[PDB]
Design a protein around this ligand. Structure first.
Ligand SMILES: O=c1[nH]cc(-c2cc(-c3cc(Cl)cc(OCc4ccccc4Cl)c3)c(=O)n(-c3cccnc3)c2)c(=O)[nH]1
Lengths: 301, 305
């Protein structure tokens, strides 16, 4: 029993974290096989940040301008290339600790674990969700860029996120491991507002099924709703629209608990209308939206 | 910036988890050098479990009644013994991944990371605190027994918790790695219930400091209180008493921030009488108590082990 926000065991990623330094700039890199991936703004100076011209800055660099350190060992850079906003440093020794892995680009609402690192050394691990506005609400200080987000499935690490920047509002922006940013952001210090952060509705419903599953039903009611009527109400609370795809995805949890998705939607509508009235749900006094339908089945069964 | 519930990186512990089987009961073991540590209740049947005699139950067992597997490799048990509620299985192979480590015993209110495992296979890691009633509010399913809790200092794993059982209220009970129970619990299928939990006052104050560090400032007022005055409020709301030691521990945060401890206690005092009712601090509608002062400093300063 119990429900925690659980991250994946971080060991397979720990074995890949290195330190990358260019000039006075030091951040983290991900060392897989004979390639070190890191954010390309490692080649920028503070004087470059407002309008960096990455292609011009990179052409001026030679292999030995890049200092890569794995633990105590210095890795020799034998080549480099840029792919979108990620720099790929070719090194002369493959990481012996390279796990089975793949790069995947995730959708808003998807969860993953973050191994926060500084100077190529892991600081801590937490579980995260890609917000609907393509930011993530992380915990990151200076030096954390190049920390990665990931899921693990059996023994395969799927990398889905690399950290690049903290926006002025305190949230965090980054790329997939092909260097393409999540959301409308750019690796340059210019004004760029994140969209409105909405609540991940399908995730909230999944967590209410998790709450039923663990023996708590005080929030249910006798009502039901149409999909459209639910969305009309929920969007007034800044909830993401719920789609038929979302409804299908909750099907397994509906069957296991005997509660129709549209009935749980009715409970959510009332929860938004009433609040908690002093109670908690799986130990939270708020509606929790960083567990996915898939996560719930994972931790509960 | 930002503030999340952060576990230590689990890599060093992942390399120590193995699967231990005795009959039809299967759970997790901690493999360090040439010894595997696991709950002594792995030798019990469900009939034994009602009132076990462990010294007798163990006398009946023999080295080959213990099937221990590290991934796909089979480990030969070559000797066994009990220390308190922990079984120690001598194997023929030293764990080549054995990290620098020590066995420690923590106190209520201190935090640690749990690596939940199943059939010797790690599945998740999460941060939790030892409650004042010596339970932990973990997330364990069947087969999680033998999972361990730990802290990391530089390169040294401090093992502090081994998981033994789930109480009927859904909370969890375990031992240190020398098999001493945390809390007034016994490893027996019998009627047991934890005492009334309380709230870890020093941890709430530290999290409020974390909030101030992250720009969340509305709960500060201009008043000060005294310990006697605050503790009466604390005692009233099932909050742990606040000691002079706690104040000194929060000293650094009182400097880095400019809010004195009783200053912040006044804020917490005011938060306790009035409330919040759906309004938030650091993304929470309740007062979080599973971050120690050290957790807040370490996270808000980037310590990297
Ligand atoms: O040596 C090093 N130098 C620099 C970094 C570094 C650099 C940035 C950064 C990078 C770019 Cl390309 C643009 C940018 O602009 C922000 C902004 C300002 C105004 C308006 C919009 C925006 Cl977006 C910022 C950063 O965010 N972080 C950081 C800090 C805290 C938490 N997480 C990440 C660290 C480093 O880690 N190491």
């Amino acid at each position: 029993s119990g429900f925690r926000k659980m991250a994946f065991p971080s060991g397979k990623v720990e074995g890949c974290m290195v330190q990358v330094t260019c000039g006075t700039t030091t951040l983290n890199g991900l060392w897989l096989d004979d390639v070190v991936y890191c954010p390309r703004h490692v080649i920028c100076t503070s004087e470059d940040m407002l309008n960096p011209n990455y292609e011009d800055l990179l052409i001026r660099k030679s292999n030995h301008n890049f200092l890569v350190q794995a633990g105590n060992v210095q890795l020799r850079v034998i080549g480099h290339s840029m792919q979108n906003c990620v720099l790929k440093l070719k090194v002369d020794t493959a990481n012996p600790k390279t796990p089975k892995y793949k790069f995947v680009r995730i959708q808003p609402g998807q969860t993953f674990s973050v191994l926060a690192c500084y100077n190529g050394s892991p600081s801590g691990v937490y579980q995260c969700a890609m917000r609907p506005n393509f930011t993530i609400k992380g915990s990151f200080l200076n030096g954390s860029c190049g920390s990665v987000g990931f899921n693990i499935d059996y023994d395969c690490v799927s990398f889905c996120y690399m950290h690049h920047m903290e926006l002025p509002t305190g949230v965090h922006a980054g790329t997939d491991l092909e260097g393409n940013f999540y959301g409308p952001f750019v690796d340059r210090q210019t004004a760029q507002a994140a969209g409105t952060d909405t609540t991940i509705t399908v995730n909230v419903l999944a967590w209410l099924y998790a709450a039923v599953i663990n023996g708590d039903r005080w929030f249910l009611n006798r009502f039901t709703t149409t999909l459209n009527d639910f969305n009309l109400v929920a969007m007034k609370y800044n909830y993401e629209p719920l789609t038929q795809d979302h409804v299908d995805i909750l099907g397994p949890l509906s069957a296991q608990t005997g509660i129709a998705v549209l009935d749980m939607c009715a409970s959510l509508k009332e929860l938004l209308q009433n609040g908690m009235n002093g109670r908690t749900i799986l130990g939270s006094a708020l509606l929790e939206d960083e567990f996915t339908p898939f996560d719930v089945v994972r931790q509960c069964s």
